[PDB]
Amino acid sequence: SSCSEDWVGYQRKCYFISTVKRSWTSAQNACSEHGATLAVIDSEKDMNFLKRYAGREEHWVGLKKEPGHPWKWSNGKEFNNWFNVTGSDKCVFLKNTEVSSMECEKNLYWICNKPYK
């Protein structure tokens, strides 16, 4: 009802976790096909959930920055910088022990989300 039975519902958002690896842009396109987007993380609850839903391997999430511009969410929303992004790259990934940046071309598993309903 709230989410497809095959997606995971938590804190008013529906999540999908990939089984294959793609670059950040290709992962975002895959998310977009489901009416979703690389995961937007608005709270500590979401972050802790994702860091665990991810597992041991790095997973792309929805923060990216274009040269000379600020970090921006995958859905275009501006990032309020509620958490700090380590590293020197332009796309963000997470896994259980960390949230950091990696070259956007790297093929990683990914997580998408979209609002409930």
Give the footprint of Zn ion on this chain (CB under 5 A).
Answer: 34
Residue with Cβ nearer a copy of itself (56 or 69):
56
Q: Is residue 77 near a copy of itself by the rule CB under 8 A? A: no
Q: Is residue 18 near a copy of itself by the rule CB under 8 A? A: no
Tell me the C-alpha distance between 93 and 62, whole Å. 8
Beta-bridged to residue 38, according to DSSP, are 112
Q: Nearest-CB residue to Zn ion? A: 34
How many residues are listed for the chain in this entry? 117
- Residue 14 Cβ vs a copy of itself, minimum distance, rounded to whole Å: 9
* φ, ψ of residue 98 in degrees (nearest 5): -175, 165
Q: Is residue 20 near a copy of itself by the rule CB under 8 A? A: no
Tell me the C-alpha distance between 45 and 39, whole Å. 13
User: What's the gap between Cα 11 and its chain centre?
Assistant: 15
Residue with Cβ nearer Zn ion (34 or 45):
34
Handedness of CA 58, 59, 60, 62 (dihedral sign): negative
Residue with Cβ nearer Zn ion (10 or 71):
10
Interaction site with a copy of itself (CB under 8 A): 1-3, 5-12, 45, 49, 52-56, 96, 116-117
